[PDB]
């Protein structure tokens, strides 16, 4: 009661091929739905057969830290980037301590808050993945990137089989109260350990060679190919068949061994509105998939390059990660209030999201006006493909539960990060309801007179990350993320005069190089 | 018990944004401009998925 | 220059801070930076022993 | 807490105060500058902790 339940453990430790990050934040949890489960749907709303939903709202909250900046500090994130070809999660240690349940009452303008010492808050971990996993969707409410900041616990809500604002019979309703949970008073605590499954290192490197440019620029090939089918000689046209062998002279015609990654073309958009086509093609123009009638837009889809060559002003309509900007709005907001990621270090293996994959024949030439070369806007597969995946970001996601089905393909979370069959389980928390003064005679009616109260406390999260040191005999210096040494009124990743932490821009992880 | 397109939490927004409107309404019928918005239970078909 | 002793490793700085205790939060989520805290202070004794 | 002139002070038993020592000199050392806020030369005196 009068004894601390835990200490403030927050720091980073660098150990050769491993790094350990520990974060601690102060949280606050209010009573949700007034201790009630509620049925929710898109019934009697803006409608739209492509936005219908059916689920439930639980009085429970949940802890989430699926954002990198929750663990690594800007400086740490830098050290990782400039010196490591890759990294991965390993172990996990979750702590919940210093439970403070506060009771609140108001009257005639007077609002006084008191301590309900004899109160409990329930906690449990869905370590069997029996409940709907909602951490895969980049939602807000995670641990504040700034340690001194205080946050609220996001409310838990799930969805089920819906048929246009109307459920089916095979739909599932889950009750979190049907789970064994540990009740904690002001002097109690809650600990939990997790072990990440074996997954490939993240690509924190950028290729030094393009898939199409691997051969030796000094030696010819012992292979030949149809050079000219027209045959020049002074007769304008005379058919004939001629062949030639590859050479540094013509590299685009040499026989390769592999092919660029898959491709699902998207529409292009210029940052300068003055350069954009008119009309509102946001929806009617965007690329989307059709799933049981209701079709959904495609966010970062197939890992494709953002822009080509110098044209750094273009970007996929919905093929890039876009983060907020502290003060940014919810609906309006212009360019100067958002941050668009630039997937560029992928142009060496993956195609460009806006342009075509390639060209394919469509007919024969038997006395027919050949050819028929048609543009390809959607590929996928083909034995021999080689591609990079989407890069992760400081404020970007971390992991995502791989849907349990009969099959999948390169289960890399399209939003980036790691795909885990068994990811860090959901940690649910809830304030125990404390009924107010009951009547003086029995009433089998559902009780509804509860004492309004909330709770606060700290929370620690320790994660051990396995690194992968770089081994390159590259002579010339490397590209490194650095801060503008120039004079400035504001220091990047700090606080303003009003005291507010702002993140200047998103940061990738691909700066060091490696031969393809 | 869930559709691939319907996994997210119907109570929480996303910290990610996307091109909301490229037409820009204001009374000039048409005026280009670029505007962005973050995902929400209001518009699930436009939220960034993972699969 | 002000006098005294020059120490490469002098008595380290001892920092102290009151843990913030958030007031009653809303009834629905808000990813906005929390700013409703319960005003409070702290007092106590402190002992310092030095052998000269 | 205060209201309409009324100012009452209470005990928050379930509250904590954080403390730590920069024994690695990682933080800016500001004791070299003869500042005020030290322990009162008179034992019976009460002082505030400098920011």
From TrEMBL, chain B:
Family statement: Belongs to the parvoviridae capsid protein family.
Cell compartment(s), UniProt: Virion
Name the UniProt record assigns to this protein: Capsid protein VP1
Organism: Adeno-associated virus 6
Automatic annotation (TrEMBL), chain D:
Organism encoding this protein: Adeno-associated virus 6
Lineage summary: Viruses, Monodnaviria, Shotokuvirae, Cossaviricota, Quintoviricetes
Similarity section: Belongs to the parvoviridae capsid protein family.
Record's subcellular location: Virion
Span within the parent record: 325 to 375 of 736
Source superkingdom: Viruses
Stated name of the protein: Capsid protein VP1
């Amino acid at each position: 009661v009068g004894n601390a339940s835990g200490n403030w453990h927050c720091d980073s430790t660098w150990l050769g091929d491993r790094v350990i990050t520990t974060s601690t934040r102060t949280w606050a949890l209010p009573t949700y739905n007034n201790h009630l489960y509620k049925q929710i749907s898109s019934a009697s709303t803006g409608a739209s057969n492509d936005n219908h939903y059916f689920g439930y709202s639980t009085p429970w909250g949940y802890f989430d830290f699926n954002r990198f900046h929750c663990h690594f500090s800007p400086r740490d994130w830098q050290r990782l980037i400039n010196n490591n070809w890759g990294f991965r999660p390993k172990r996990l240690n979750f702590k919940l301590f210093n439970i403070q349940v506060k009771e609140v009452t108001t009257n005639d303008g007077v609002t006084t808050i008191a301590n309900n010492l004899t109160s409990t808050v329930q906690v449990f971990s869905d370590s069997e993945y029996q409940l709907p996993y909602v951490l895969g969707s980049a939602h807000q409410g995670c641990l504040p990137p700034f340690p001194a900041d205080v946050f609220m616990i996001p409310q838990y809500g799930y969805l089920t089989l819906n048929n246009g604002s109307q459920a089916v019979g095979r739909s599932s309703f889950y009750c979190l109260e049907y789970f064994p949970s540990q009740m904690l008073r002001t002097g109690n605590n809650f600990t939990f350990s997790y072990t990440f499954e074996d997954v490939p290192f993240h690509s924190s490197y950028a290729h030094s060679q393009s898939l199409d440019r691997l051969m030796n620029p000094l030696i010819d090939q012992y292979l030949y190919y149809l050079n000219r089918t027209q045959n020049q000689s002074g007769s304008a046209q005379n058919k004939d068949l001629l062949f030639s062998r590859g050479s540094p002279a013509g590299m685009s015609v040499q026989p390769k061994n592999w092919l660029p990654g898959p491709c699902y073309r998207q529409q292009r958009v210029s940052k300068t509105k003055t350069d954009n086509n008119n009309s509102n093609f946001t929806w009617t123009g965007a690329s989307k998939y059709n799933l049981n009638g209701r079709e959904s837009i495609i966010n970062p889809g197939t890992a494709m390059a953002s822009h080509k060559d110098d044209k750094d002003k273009f970007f996929p309509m919905s093929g890039v990660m876009i983060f907020g900007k502290e003060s940014a709005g919810a609906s309006n907001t212009a360019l100067d209030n958002v941050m668009i990621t630039d997937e560029e270090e992928i142009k060496a293996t993956n195609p460009v999201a806006t342009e075509r994959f390639g060209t394919v024949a469509v007919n024969l030439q038997s006395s027919s006006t050949d050819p028929a070369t048609g543009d390809v806007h959607v590929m996928g597969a083909l034995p021999g493909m080689v591609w990079q995946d989407r890069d992760v970001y400081l404020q970007g996601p971390i992991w995502a539960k791989i849907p349990h089905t009969d099959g999948h393909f390169h289960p890399s979370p399209l939003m980036g990060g790691f795909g885990l069959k068994h990811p860090p389980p959901q940690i649910l928390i809830k304030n125990t309801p404390v009924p107010a003064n009951p009547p003086a005679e029995f009433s089998a009616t559902k009780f509804a007179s509860f004492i309004t109260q909330y709770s606060t406390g700290q929370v620690s999260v320790e994660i051990e990350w396995e690194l992968q040191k770089e081994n390159s005999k590259r002579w010339n210096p490397e590209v490194q993320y650095t801060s503008n040494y120039a004079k400035s009124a504001n220091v990047d990743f700090t606080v303003d005069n009003n005291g507010l932490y702002t993140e200047p821009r998103p940061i990738g992880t691909r700066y060091l190089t490696r031969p393809l």
